[PDB]
Each structure stands twice: as C-alpha cells, then as structure tokens.
Amino acid sequence: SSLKEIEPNLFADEDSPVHGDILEFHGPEGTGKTEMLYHLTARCILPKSEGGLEVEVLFIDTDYHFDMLRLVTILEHRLSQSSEEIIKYCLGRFFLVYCSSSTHLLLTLYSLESMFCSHPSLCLLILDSLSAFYWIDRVNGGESVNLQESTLRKCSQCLEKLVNDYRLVLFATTQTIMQIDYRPYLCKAWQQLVKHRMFFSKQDDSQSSNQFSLVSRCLKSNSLKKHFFIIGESGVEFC
Amino acid sequence: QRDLVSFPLSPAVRVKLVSAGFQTAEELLEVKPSELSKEVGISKAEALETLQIIRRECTALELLEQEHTQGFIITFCSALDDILGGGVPLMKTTEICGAPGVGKTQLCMQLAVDVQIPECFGGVAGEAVFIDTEGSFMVDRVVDLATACIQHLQLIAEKHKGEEHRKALEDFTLDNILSHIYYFRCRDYTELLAQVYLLPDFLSEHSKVRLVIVDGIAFPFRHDLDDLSLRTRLLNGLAQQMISLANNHRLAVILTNQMTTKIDRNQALLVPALGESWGHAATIRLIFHWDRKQRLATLYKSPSQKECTVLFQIKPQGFRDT
Amino acid sequence: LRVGLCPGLTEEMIQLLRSHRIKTVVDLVSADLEEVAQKCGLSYKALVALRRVLLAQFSAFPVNGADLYEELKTSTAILSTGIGSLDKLLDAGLYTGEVTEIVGGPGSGKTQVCLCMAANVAHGLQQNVLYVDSNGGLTASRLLQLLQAKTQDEEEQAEALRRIQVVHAFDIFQMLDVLQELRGTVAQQVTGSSGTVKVVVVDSVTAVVSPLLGGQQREGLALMMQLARELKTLARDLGMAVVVTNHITRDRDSGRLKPALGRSWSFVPSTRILLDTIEGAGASGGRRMACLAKSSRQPTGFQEMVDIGTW
Numbered sequence: 081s082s083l084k085e086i087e088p089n090l091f092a093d094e095d096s097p098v099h100g101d102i103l104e105f106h107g108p109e110g111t112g113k114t115e116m117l118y119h120l121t122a123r124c125i126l127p128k129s130e131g132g133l134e135v136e137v138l139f140i141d142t143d144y145h146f147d148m149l150r151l152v153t154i155l156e157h158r159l160s161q162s163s164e165e166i167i168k169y170c171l172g173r174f175f176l177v178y179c180s181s182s183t184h185l186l187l188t189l190y191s192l193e194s195m196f197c198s199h200p201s202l203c204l205l206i207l208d209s210l211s212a213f214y215w216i217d218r219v220n221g222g223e224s225v226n227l228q229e230s231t232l233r234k235c236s237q238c239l240e241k242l243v244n245d246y247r248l249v250l251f252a253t254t255q256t257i258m259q260i261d262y263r264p265y266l267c268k269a270w271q272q273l274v275k276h277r278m279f280f281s282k283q284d285d286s287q288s289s290n291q292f293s294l295v296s297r298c299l300k301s302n303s304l305k306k307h308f309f310i311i312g313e314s315g316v317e318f319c
Numbered sequence: 320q321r322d323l324v325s326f327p328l329s330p331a332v333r334v335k336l337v338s339a340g341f342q343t344a345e346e347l348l349e350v351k352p353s354e355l356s357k358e359v360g361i362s363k364a365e366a367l368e369t370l371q372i373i374r375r376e377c378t379a380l381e382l383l384e385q386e387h388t389q390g391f392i393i394t395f396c397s398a399l400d401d402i403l404g405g406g407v408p409l410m411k412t413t414e415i416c417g418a419p420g421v422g423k424t425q426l427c428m429q430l431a432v433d434v435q436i437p438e439c440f441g442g443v444a445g446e447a448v449f450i451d452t453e454g455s456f457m458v459d460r461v462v463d464l465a466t467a468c469i470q471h472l473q474l475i476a477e478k479h480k481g482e483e484h485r486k487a488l489e490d491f492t493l494d495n496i497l498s499h500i501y502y503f504r505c506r507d508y509t510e511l512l513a514q515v516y517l518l519p520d521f522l523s524e525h526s527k528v529r530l531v532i533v534d535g536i537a538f539p540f541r542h543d544l545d546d547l548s549l550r551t552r553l554l555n556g557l558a559q560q561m562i563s564l565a566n567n568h569r570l571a572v573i574l575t576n577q578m579t580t581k582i583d584r585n586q587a588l589l590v591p592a593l594g595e596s597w598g599h600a601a602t603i604r605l606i607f608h609w610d611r612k613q614r615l616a617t618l619y620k621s622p623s624q625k626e627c628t629v630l631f632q633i634k635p636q637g638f639r640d641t
Numbered sequence: 642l643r644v645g646l647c648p649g650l651t652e653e654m655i656q657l658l659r660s661h662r663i664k665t666v667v668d669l670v671s672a673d674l675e676e677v678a679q680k681c682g683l684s685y686k687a688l689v690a691l692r693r694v695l696l697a698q699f700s701a702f703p704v705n706g707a708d709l710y711e712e713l714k715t716s717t718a719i720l721s722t723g724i725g726s727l728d729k730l731l732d733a734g735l736y737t738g739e740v741t742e743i744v745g746g747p748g749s750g751k752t753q754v755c756l757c758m759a760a761n762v763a764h765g766l767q768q769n770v771l772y773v774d775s776n777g778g779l780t781a782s783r784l785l786q787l788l789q790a791k792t793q794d795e796e797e798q799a800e801a802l803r804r805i806q807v808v809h810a811f812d813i814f815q816m817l818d819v820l821q822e823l824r825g826t827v828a829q830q831v832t833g834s835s836g837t838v839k840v841v842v843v844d845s846v847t848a849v850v851s852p853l854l855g856g857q858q859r860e861g862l863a864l865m866m867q868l869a870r871e872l873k874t875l876a877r878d879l880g881m882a883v884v885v886t887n888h889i890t891r892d893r894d895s896g897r898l899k900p901a902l903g904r905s906w907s908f909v910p911s912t913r914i915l916l917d918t919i920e921g922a923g924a925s926g927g928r929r930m931a932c933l934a935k936s937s938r939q940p941t942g943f944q945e946m947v948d949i950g951t952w
C-alpha cells in the first residue's frame with residue numbers, strides 16, 4: 081500500500097506504506113472530478129494482470145450522479161481483451177452506498193462498521209459531495225453556529241476515527257459556491273483533517289476542451305504541483 | 320417522509336424543533352401536543368398553528384373540454400382573432416407593447432366593451448375590471464365604443480332575423496354595459512400592489528367578472544426606484560400572483576407595457592422595457608409599431624400559434640380591420 | 642425517542658435515558674455506552690442488542706457492484722424524444738434515473754420540446770406522464786395538433802391523452818406538496834404493475850424560485866436545495882425520467898451566457914441542453930440551435946441544428 085504506485089504523477093514524492101490519507105477535490109461544475117474518480121476506480125479494480133491492484137473499494141453516493149453505463153464503458157475500453165464474464169467478475173467487487181440526509185449519512189457511517197471489520201480487504205474509500213447538505217443544515221440551525229455543523233462535526237469525527245483505525249485512503253469531493261482561489265465554508269476540524277488540495281480548473285476553448293489544469297499543495301511543504309490531462313471515452317490519460 | 324423545511328412554519332419554531340431532534344413531519348402526528356410543547360418550549364397557540372398548517376399540506380381531456388366550452392374575447396379584428404386562434408384566450412396572461420399613439424388604450428377599452436357581448440353572438444357575457452395607473456380612462460370614448468358595438472350587434476341580429484338574438488340584445492343596453500365596468504385608480508406602485516392583494520376576494524364576490532385590465536405597468540415601476548433587484552423581485556412576485564389569479568378565477572388578463580431604445584454600435588432598436596427577465600412572465604406577447612401610415616400587430620411570443628403580422632386601424636367606431 | 646417502533650423497548654428505560662439527551666437515536670448510537678450502565682443503570686447485554694437492532698433498521702446496507710449491474714440490465718430503459726436531431730445529439734433518447742435540464746431564452750424552444758416529448762412518450766410507448774405547469778404555458782390544442790400529426794384515429798388520441806396528467810403549482814409549497822404526494826402514492830403502489838408514471842416534466846422551475854431569491858435571506862436557497870434533493874431522489878431512488886426547464890442569464894463581467902439560479906443550482910442536473918435562435922439568415926420559424934453544455938457520457942461543446950416547426 082505505497083503511494084508511489086497509486087499515482088506517481090499527481091503525487092511527486094510522498095511514497096510510503098500509508099497508515100491513512102485524506103484527499104479532497106474542489107472545482108466548479110463540469111470540470112472532471114467524477115471522471116477522475118472513475119479513472120482511479122478503473123485503475124484500482126482490474127485484475128493484477130491488466131495493470132490492476134485487486135484491492136477493495138467502497139463508493140458513497142450522495143450527489144446521485146454516479147453513472148454505471150459510463151463506468152462499464154470505461155472498463156471495457158481500458159483493458160485489452162473484453163468479455164462479459166470477466167467484467168462481471170471485476171464488478172463483483174465494487175461497493176455502492178446511498179444517503180439522503182446528514183443524520184442518515186451518520187447512521188450509514190456507523191452501520192458500515194460491521195462489514196468493514198468483517199473485511200480486512202477494504203483499503204480504499206470514496207466519498208463525494210460531503211457539502212451537499214451544507215445549506216440545509218446551515219439554515220435549520222438558525223443563527224446558532226453550534227446548532228449548525230454539529231452533525232457534520234460528528235460525522236467528521238467518525239470518519240477520522242475509522243480512517244486512523246483501519247489505515248484507509250480516502251478521496252473526497254467538495255463544491256464551489258461562494259466568491260488558486262479558495263473560500264472555506266465547512267467545519268474547522270475537517271479542514272484540519274485534510275492533507276492535500278486538488279483545485280480543479282477547466283479551459284474554455286474547444287481545443288483544450290479535453291485538457292484541464294490541476295493544482296496541488298502539500299500542507300507540510302506548501303509546494304505547488306501542476307498537471308495537464310486529456311479526457312477520453314476510454315477514460316483519463318495524461319500528458 | 321416529509322421534511323419540515325417543506326412546510327410554511329415559522330423559522331423560530333423550526334429552529335426549536337431541529338434543536339429538540341425533529342426532522343420529519345410524520346413523527347409529529349403521533350405525539351400529544353402537550354408533551355412536545357413542554358419538550359420544545361412552545362406555547363399552545365403556535366403549537367396548534369403548526370399542527371393545522373402541517374395538516375393542510377384533471378386529465379388533458381378535461382382540459383380540452385374546458386378550453387372548448389369557453390370561448391375567446393373577440394377584438395373586432397378578424398385577422399387578429401385568426402392569428403390569436405379566436406381572440407384573447409382565458410386563463411392566459413397577455414402583454415401589449417408599443418410606442419405612444421399606437422392604440423394600446425383603445426384596445427383595452429374595446430376589450431372591456433366586448434367582454435360583455437352575449438354568448439348567443441359568440442361572446443363570453445362577463446364583466447370587466449379596469450385598473451388605471453396613468454389616468455387615461457375617458458368615459459366618452461367608452462360610450463362611443465359601446466354605441467358602435469350596439470349598432471353592429473343590432474344590425475347583425477336584424478339581418479340574421481332570429482328569435483333569441485333579439486331577447487339577448489334586449490338587456491344589452493348602454494346603461495347595462497356601462498354599469499358592468501369596475502374602475503380603480505392607482506398612483507404609486509404600493510397602491511397597485513394593494514389593489515392586487517385585494518383582487519381575490521373582490522373577484523370571489525363578483526363571480527361574473529371575466530376580464531382584468533391593468534393599463535400601464537411600466538410607469539409605476541420606472542420612476543424613483545434606484546434598487547434594480549427590488550424591482551425585479553416585485554415584478555416576479557406580481558407576475559406569479561397575476562397568473563395564479565387568472566388560472567384560479569377563470570380570467571383573461573391583459574397588461575400594457577412601454578417601449579424603450581437599445582443602442583448597439585451606431586444603430587438603435589426599439590425593445591420592450593422592464594429588463595429581460597420580464598419577457599418570460601407574459602404567456603402571450605404582442606407588439607404594435609408604425610410602418611409609413613400603417614399600423615401593424617405582430618405576435619412575438621406564443622406557445623400555440625405561429626408568428627404573424629396583422630394590419631389594423633383605429634376609427635371613430637373603434638378598433639377595426641384594414 | 643419514540644415508543645413502539647422496535648421490540649424490547651420498555652416504558653421505564655425511555656425516561657431513564659433522559660440523562661444524556663432526547664433529540665434523536667444518535668444519542669443512543671453515538672455515545673460511549675460503557676458509562677451508561679452506571680450513569681443510569683442498564684444491562685450490558687440488552688443495551689448492545691438494542692443498539693444493534695436500532696442501527697439495523699435505521700440505516701442502509703451497501704449493495705455489491707455485480708448485483709447492481711445485473712439489476713440495471715433489466716430495469717433501466719431509454720425513451721426517445723421524438724426528434725432525430727435531439728436523439729442523435731443525446732444518444733437516441735434520454736435515460737431514466739437522471740435529471741435533464743433544458744435552458745433557453747424567452748420563447749425559444751423549451752415548452753414546445755417538452756410538449757412534443759410528452760406526446761411521443763404518451764403515444765409511442767403507452768405510458769403515464771405527469772406535467773407540472775407553473776407558468777401557464779400549456780394549451781391542450783398544441784397537444785392535439787401533435788397527436789394529429791402522429792396518428793389519425795380519434796380513440797387512439799383520446800387514449801393517449803388519458804395518460805397525461807397536469808397539475809398547477811404557482812409557488813414552491815404547492816410544487817413540493819404535489820411531488821411528495823406522487824412520491825407517497827408511488828411508494829405505496831409498488832405492488833401493482835399498471836398505471837405507474839415514468840416521466841414527469843416541470844414546465845418551469847425559475848417561475849416559482851426567482852421570487853424567493855434576491856437580497857440577504859437564506860430560506861429561498863434552502864427551499865431550492867430541498868426541491869433539488871426531492872427531484873434527485875425521485876429520479877434515482879425510483880427510476881424515473883425527470884425533465885425541467887430553466888431560464889438563461891447574461892453575465893456582467895464576462896458577458897457570456899450563463900444558466901440562472903446561480904452556482905448552487907449549477908450542480909443539480911446531470912445533462913444540460915441549451916437552445917438558441919439562429920440570428921440573421923434562417924431566423925424565426927422553427928430553425929434554432931441545440932447544444933450540449935453538460936453530460937456524464939459525452940464530451941461537451943458540440944453543436945447541432947434542430948427545428949421546432951416540423952412536428
């Protein structure tokens with residue numbers, strides 16, 4: 081479970097067997113966060129023979145924007161030899177969970193622990209749009225700051241406990257609402273829990289309609305990394 | 320499972336409820352009001368109000384039958400009626416724009432007169448409500464238009480030589496038609512909003528009204544109003560209220576707008592005023608403009624018919640053809 | 642806490658556990674239950690069993706990818722819009738289970754496209770469709786004209802019209818009420834297999850949302866987010882095809898076309914269609930521009946020419 085093999089391109093020099101890492105994605109609409117997650121799942125789900133890793137992955141769906149036809153098309157167009165049996169065998173490992181509210185999210189977080197401890201093979205976790213319910217619970221609590229964000233703080237505590245308990249690697253998805261620009265609006269604790277930021281940007285022109293820019297910083301070094309990549313029907317490819 | 324946010328309860332009571340651990344309306348129905356009230360620190364009156372507001376919250380064939388059983392309002396213009404599908408449709412908001420002197424007010428007066436035509440001749444036989452914001456309502460013009468309609472209907476009935484036509488025209492006299500037009504006057508936009516708020520109950524008691532006219536909507540909103548966002552919010556709310564009222568009370572609504580000049584490069588175009596978002600409010604939009612000495616009516620936006628151009632004229636009898 | 646929901650709950654323990662908190666079951670599940678046995682006095686063996694069963698009935702369990710693959714192999718479907726240009730633009734029809742948004746200028750094409758799609762689905766597939774008319778832009782004569790353009794049998798037209806339901810909602814509350822009523826009635830009527838609704842169209846969401854927005858308030862944005870969440874869960878958790886229409890705005894600093902309702906609403910739909918009128922030559926009539934601004938299965942920015950006067 082070394083970070084050099086996971087993504088040597090985005091992660092320049094952070095290679096070590098990870099005891100736990102938190103990654104989050106930030107970007108406006110239609111930039112490619114979901115496509116990047118699809119590429120990561122494709123590279124993490126295939127058999128070891130076809131450049132895969134053969135390790136478990138769990139996907140929490142909150143935006144309700146997960147598309148399975150796109151995922152199966154990406155997996156079919158990624159590998160070399162394609163068949164129904166092998167694709168079924170590969171997709172027998174993907175895990176998907178649905179949520180509807182912050183309280184329901186916390187209940188699902190707590191409930192997952194049974195299967196989670198029953199499976200030591202689980203090593204990678206995916207969460208998307210943890211700020212989907214930001215406005216709802218910000219308005220429910222009124223002016224009382226403590227009244228709002230409280231369930232989100234409890235959820236962050238539970239996630240941190242799990243990830244530092246059973247050595248997970250986590251990728252998160254955020255949203256751009258207000259205003260290298262960045263204006264945080266979540267709880268302070270989860271802001272501290274982050275390790276790197278993946279700022280997502282998109283170029284307007286049709287020539288660069290497939291090329292996008294990524295900026296990453298390290299909390300302990302404040303070093304900037306730039307990356308250009310091209311999207312495709314077969315998945316995501318780099319420059 | 321229905322969220323509490325989906326209900327029109329007070330922000331304070333919703334904050335208290337979410338503080339006490341309430342997130343669904345279904346769980347509220349199984350709790351005695353006393354226990355929940357003492358748990359959340361809410362008095363009896365507002366608790367009962369919450370309980371009652373929670374409690375309170377048509378196939379296309381029927382729509383076709385309803386559309387066909389009620390006619391349109393004729394404008395005495397054959398080509399305009401043809402391009403409108405029969406005239407001004409009920410349950411639909413209509414907007415008219417044009418430079419000064421084209422005849423928007425004449426059209427409003429003609430519609431107010433025509434809405435009372437007996438159904439035996441193809442009319443709706445309903446009243447009319449006229450709201451004036453610029454003081455352009457002249458009774459003499461209405462009298463002339465009513466007399467012209469009287470003469471036209473009498474001539475048609477005499478030529479046809481029916482039996483029920485004469486009976487229908489017997490009560491269709493100048494006094495009767497003039498007594499069925501209700502006049503209101505608004506100077507500021509606050510007065511217009513107040514009259515709009517009073518409109519529902521008045522229409523409830525006066526159930527035979529089939530027409531609502533607001534002659535002049537740009538004037539109250541284009542002067543002494545610096546905040547554009549407030550004007551936009553007020554206009555959106557007014558449009559929503561007007562369409563809701565028109566659909567609920569089976570009414571035909573006509574609004575009058577004013578033109579303005581838009582300059583690009585070195586040429587100027589005449590466009591309707593009150594911004595761009597106002598264009599979505601009107602269900603049907605018409606535009607009057609000049610061409611040499613001829614007056615043209617153009618159907619700009621409509622979800623039922625196609626764009627057309629109609630030549631009309633203003634005569635001593637009123638809005639007419641040619 | 643509530644009584645009668647799960648077995649094993651006693652009328653004494655509920656008032657005994659008042660020491661910590663009363664809000665929700667999160668108090669029972671998100672506490673360190675070791676100290677409860679002495680803070681109030683509880684049996685260790687019963688407490689863990691009650692917490693486990695409560696967490697079981699009050700959560701969700703993950704489903705394996707292969708099972709989801711197999712179940713979508715027999716559940717999802719694709720419904721053509723009745724226009725060859727749109728079909729080839731968005732792969733021969735729209736997919737149930739997602740949210741489709743149509744954005745255009747005043748009077749461009751949105752209502753006509755919605756009406757033609759509804760007529761096709763009601764006649765070409767024999768299924769029930771609900772229409773939510775908010776701005777008053779729906780005349781039955783247009784639907785009759787489209788049906789006549791499709792077929793000539795009067796009884797066929799009547800039967801196709803009998804599968805179209807129209808509801809009026811001039812504010813956010815009425816729309817939420819009717820949508821929740823549909824959710825409840827469909828969730829209750831899962832046993833049956835006839836009369837279900839597969840496509841619901843909202844004529845205009847900007848009509849009932851714009852008055853709330855504007856100023857320094859927060860309730861309008863929260864209501865918009867709640868409506869978006871309701872639409873998304875109706876589309877996904879039930880497998881339905883939802884189509885909504887929205888207005889278009891012109892940016893000030895950049896001067897570029899931009900969808901209304903703001904950045905928070907910008908993330909709601911999954912497929913975006915933009916309609917514009919071709920200026921100059923070929924203007925007016927049905928000749929218009931159709932573009933794809935957002936999709937999860939196609940690259941964006943593509944161009945296509947469509948007409949709204951040939952059906």
Ligand SMILES: Nc1ncnc2c1ncn2[C@@H]1O[C@H](COP(=O)(O)OP(=O)(O)OP(=O)(O)O)[C@@H](O)[C@H]1O
Pocket residue numbers: 598599601602619620621622623624625626745746747748749750751752753754776778783845926927949950
């Ligand atoms: N026979 C016809 N029947 C109806 N509409 C037609 C016909 N022929 C052409 N059209 C066009 O249909 C359009 C209807 O616009 P539509 O209501 O679909 O647009 P919209 O953007 O949804 O409007 P709104 O913002 O007013 O709700 C008109 O602009 C008109 O040019």
Ligand SMILES: Nc1ncnc2c1ncn2[C@@H]1O[C@H](COP(=O)(O)OP(=O)(O)OP(=O)(O)O)[C@@H](O)[C@H]1O
Pocket residue numbers: 107108109110111112113114115145311312313314908935936937938939940941942
């Ligand atoms: N087959 C494909 N080939 C090329 N590009 C594609 C293909 N399918 C999708 N895309 C592109 O992928 C881009 C990313 O779309 P997507 O909705 O996944 O973005 P996202 O930023 O992750 O989502 P969101 O806007 O919901 O935050 C789209 O702009 C689209 O142009």
Ligand SMILES: Nc1ncnc2c1ncn2[C@@H]1O[C@H](COP(=O)(O)OP(=O)(O)O)[C@@H](O)[C@H]1O
Pocket residue numbers: 417418419420421422423424425426460633634635
């Ligand atoms: N008694 C009449 N006989 C003939 N024409 C008239 C008579 N009264 C008014 N008109 C014509 O009708 C037009 C009325 O325009 P008007 O409705 O006032 O436009 P607006 O309301 O946009 O200012 C005038 O141009 C005038 O020439």
Ligand SMILES: [Mg+2]
Pocket residue numbers: 113114143145
């Ligand atoms: Mg996405």
Ligand SMILES: [Mg+2]
Pocket residue numbers: 423424455
């Ligand atoms: Mg006038």
Ligand SMILES: [Mg+2]
Pocket residue numbers: 622748751752778
């Ligand atoms: Mg429309």
